[PDB]
Design an enzyme around this catalytic site. Structure first.
Site, PDB file in Angstrom:
ATOM      1  N   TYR A  26      20.502  11.328  48.312  1.00 26.03           N
ATOM      2  CA  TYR A  26      21.628  11.014  47.450  1.00 26.03           C
ATOM      3  C   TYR A  26      21.680  11.975  46.267  1.00 26.03           C
ATOM      4  O   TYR A  26      20.726  12.696  45.968  1.00 26.03           O
ATOM      5  CB  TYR A  26      21.565   9.561  46.967  1.00 26.03           C
ATOM      6  CG  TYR A  26      20.400   9.216  46.063  1.00 26.03           C
ATOM      7  CD1 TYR A  26      19.191   8.782  46.593  1.00 26.03           C
ATOM      8  CD2 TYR A  26      20.522   9.282  44.677  1.00 26.03           C
ATOM      9  CE1 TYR A  26      18.130   8.449  45.770  1.00 26.03           C
ATOM     10  CE2 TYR A  26      19.466   8.961  43.850  1.00 26.03           C
ATOM     11  CZ  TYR A  26      18.275   8.545  44.401  1.00 26.03           C
ATOM     12  OH  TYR A  26      17.224   8.217  43.575  1.00 26.03           O
ATOM     13  N   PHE A  36      23.400  11.736  36.568  1.00 24.86           N
ATOM     14  CA  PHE A  36      22.499  10.703  36.077  1.00 24.86           C
ATOM     15  C   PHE A  36      21.307  10.443  36.982  1.00 24.86           C
ATOM     16  O   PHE A  36      20.346   9.816  36.525  1.00 24.86           O
ATOM     17  CB  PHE A  36      23.255   9.386  35.841  1.00 24.86           C
ATOM     18  CG  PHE A  36      23.927   8.825  37.067  1.00 24.86           C
ATOM     19  CD1 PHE A  36      25.227   9.191  37.388  1.00 24.86           C
ATOM     20  CD2 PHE A  36      23.279   7.899  37.876  1.00 24.86           C
ATOM     21  CE1 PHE A  36      25.853   8.668  38.502  1.00 24.86           C
ATOM     22  CE2 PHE A  36      23.899   7.380  38.995  1.00 24.86           C
ATOM     23  CZ  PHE A  36      25.188   7.764  39.307  1.00 24.86           C
ATOM     24  N   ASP A  37      21.317  10.897  38.233  1.00 19.71           N
ATOM     25  CA  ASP A  37      20.209  10.681  39.151  1.00 19.71           C
ATOM     26  C   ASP A  37      20.305  11.718  40.260  1.00 19.71           C
ATOM     27  O   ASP A  37      21.400  12.164  40.611  1.00 19.71           O
ATOM     28  CB  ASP A  37      20.231   9.264  39.738  1.00 19.71           C
ATOM     29  CG  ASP A  37      18.920   8.877  40.401  1.00 19.71           C
ATOM     30  OD1 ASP A  37      17.981   9.701  40.419  1.00 19.71           O
ATOM     31  OD2 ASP A  37      18.826   7.736  40.901  1.00 19.71           O
ATOM     32  N   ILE A  56      22.685  -1.029  45.268  1.00 18.14           N
ATOM     33  CA  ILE A  56      23.958  -1.579  44.811  1.00 18.14           C
ATOM     34  C   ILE A  56      24.912  -1.772  45.984  1.00 18.14           C
ATOM     35  O   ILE A  56      24.663  -1.285  47.093  1.00 18.14           O
ATOM     36  CB  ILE A  56      24.588  -0.670  43.745  1.00 18.14           C
ATOM     37  CG1 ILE A  56      24.788   0.723  44.331  1.00 18.14           C
ATOM     38  CG2 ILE A  56      23.713  -0.619  42.506  1.00 18.14           C
ATOM     39  CD1 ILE A  56      25.589   1.657  43.476  1.00 18.14           C
ATOM     40  N   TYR A  82      27.874  -1.925  38.372  1.00 24.49           N
ATOM     41  CA  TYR A  82      27.458  -2.120  36.989  1.00 24.49           C
ATOM     42  C   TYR A  82      28.602  -2.367  36.012  1.00 24.49           C
ATOM     43  O   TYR A  82      28.352  -2.359  34.802  1.00 24.49           O
ATOM     44  CB  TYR A  82      26.661  -0.909  36.481  1.00 24.49           C
ATOM     45  CG  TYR A  82      25.322  -0.668  37.142  1.00 24.49           C
ATOM     46  CD1 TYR A  82      24.202  -1.406  36.783  1.00 24.49           C
ATOM     47  CD2 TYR A  82      25.174   0.325  38.100  1.00 24.49           C
ATOM     48  CE1 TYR A  82      22.971  -1.173  37.383  1.00 24.49           C
ATOM     49  CE2 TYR A  82      23.952   0.565  38.704  1.00 24.49           C
ATOM     50  CZ  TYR A  82      22.855  -0.184  38.342  1.00 24.49           C
ATOM     51  OH  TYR A  82      21.641   0.058  38.943  1.00 24.49           O
ATOM     52  N   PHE A  99      29.100   9.783  44.454  1.00 25.02           N
ATOM     53  CA  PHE A  99      27.856  10.111  45.133  1.00 25.02           C
ATOM     54  C   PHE A  99      28.088  11.108  46.255  1.00 25.02           C
ATOM     55  O   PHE A  99      29.062  11.002  47.003  1.00 25.02           O
ATOM     56  CB  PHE A  99      27.188   8.861  45.708  1.00 25.02           C
ATOM     57  CG  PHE A  99      26.722   7.901  44.666  1.00 25.02           C
ATOM     58  CD1 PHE A  99      25.549   8.132  43.971  1.00 25.02           C
ATOM     59  CD2 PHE A  99      27.461   6.768  44.378  1.00 25.02           C
ATOM     60  CE1 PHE A  99      25.120   7.249  43.005  1.00 25.02           C
ATOM     61  CE2 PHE A  99      27.036   5.879  43.419  1.00 25.02           C
ATOM     62  CZ  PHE A  99      25.866   6.120  42.728  1.00 25.02           C
TER      63      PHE A  99
END
Length: 107
Positions: A26, A36-37, A56, A82, A99
């Site tokens: 991912y 962010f990731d 999620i 979120y 993503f």
């Protein structure tokens, strides 16, 4: 809502099912925002299974809507991950998630 935008190559038949642990490269990205990731940076491609509500909601439906080798593009609504809550310090409330997901899995 999970909306699939696939970069072509793969097989289109090997679908993830229940009780299966799948491996995903991912890549997190904020809409009108930065990263962010990233699974690509830690070099550990996030072994996880399907059916335990670990991930999620929008990422959960997008994995079953892919196949082996494919490269889709996920777009998560706020209310599935979120949006009312906001992940503390990392994701603000009412945020839209982007993503890049490749499925190179086993089982």
């Amino acid at each position: 809502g999970v909306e699939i935008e696939t970069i072509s190559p793969g097989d289109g038949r090997t679908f993830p099912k229940k009780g299966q642990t799948c491996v995903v490269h991912y890549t997190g990205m904020l809409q009108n925002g930065k990263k962010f990731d990233s699974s690509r940076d830690r070099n550990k491609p996030f072994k996880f299974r399907i059916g335990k509500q670990e991930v999620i909601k929008g990422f959960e439906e997008g994995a079953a809507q892919m196949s082996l080798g494919q490269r889709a593009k996920l777009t998560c609504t706020p209310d599935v991950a979120y949006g009312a809550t906001g992940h503390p310090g990392v994701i603000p409330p009412n945020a839209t998630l982007i993503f890049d997901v490749e499925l190179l899995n086993l089982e």
